[PDB]
Amino acid sequence: MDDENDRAARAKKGSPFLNTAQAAFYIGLSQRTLEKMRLTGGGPKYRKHGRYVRYHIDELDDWSKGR
Amino acid sequence: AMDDENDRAARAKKGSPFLNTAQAAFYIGLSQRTLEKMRLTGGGPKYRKHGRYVRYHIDELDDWSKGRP
Amino acid sequence: MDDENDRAARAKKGSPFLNTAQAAFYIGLSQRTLEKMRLTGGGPKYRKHGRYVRYHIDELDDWSKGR
Amino acid sequence: MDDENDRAARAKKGSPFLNTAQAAFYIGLSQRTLEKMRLTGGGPKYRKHGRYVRYHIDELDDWSKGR
Ligand SMILES: [Cl-]
Ligand SMILES: [Cl-]
Ligand SMILES: [Cl-]
Ligand SMILES: [Cl-]
């Protein structure tokens, strides 16, 4: 394989990021449990998109599997 | 046809493939304690640790039921 | 058309599995009869759920219909 | 590795650049939100291609990943 052109072309076709409400529902936790995981750690990697918090679907899945 | 990260994220926004112990036990026809005990004895299905909360992927449940190695 | 989200949602609403007693009553056999068929390597396909034999309703019907 | 011929060959097949609408949708913010951040020094690096703003996908990802 993947170069910058494939990455850009895929990025124009959709998004891999979920918000907190979506990440929590997908992984089967309370939104508040997920938020509290940010502050104490132990939860999945997030991204700070400035103000907003965003979760990359493949980082959710990695965390779930222990990978 | 092979799904990319956009595809996976788009499905994840529409549902969840995970069950808690109580739901997983009901689905497989066992008591919750029996399923919990198998986490100690071994011999039950793969599960995920989502922090301190145990979750079961429905397809890893079906795998275990069907005897996939 | 079903994906992993559909399968989990359905699994959360009930169970397709019968124990030996239920399966026997359903196919019109004694519980003992159904066990011996299993122990002799015959009868319907079943699942080992740990120490507990379980029967999927559709595998029960497949075996009954000889197809 | 790449020589200049390789870079040119790749540039002739695709573009690594997204506009604001595309870049916003990919990182999961509104278009307006992403514009706003151009004034803040919070958001991702951008290129000014004359009058028009463009985001290199790899800089989008570096900013999200916190570099
Ligand atoms: Cl919770
Ligand atoms: Cl039981
Ligand atoms: Cl009989
Ligand atoms: Cl060169």
Author numbering:
A (entry chain C), C (entry chain A), D (entry chain D): 1 to 67
B (entry chain B): 0 to 68
Quote the passages of the study that discuss this structure, keeping the authors' original sentences.
The recombination directionality factors from Mesorhizobium spp. (RdfS) are involved in regulating the excision and transfer of integrative and conjugative elements. Excision of ICEMlSymR7A requires IntS and the RDF (also known as excisionase) RdfS, which when expressed stimulates ICEMlSymR7A excision and the concomitant formation of attP and attB. Secondary-structure prediction of RdfS proteins found in Mesorhizobium spp. suggest that they are members of the MerR superfamily of winged-helix–turn–helix (wHTH) DNA-binding proteins.
In this study, we cloned and overexpressed RdfS from M. japonicum R7A and determined its X-ray crystal structure to 2.45 Å resolution. We note that the 21 C-terminal amino acids of the protein are completely dis­ordered, as expected from their sequence PPEPGSDDDKGGSGSADEGARS. The biological significance of this quaternary structure has yet to be confirmed; however, the superficial similarity to the polymers formed by other structurally similar proteins such as BldC and Xis may suggest a role for cooperative DNA binding in the regulation of ICE excision, the activation of conjugative transfer and transcriptional regulation.
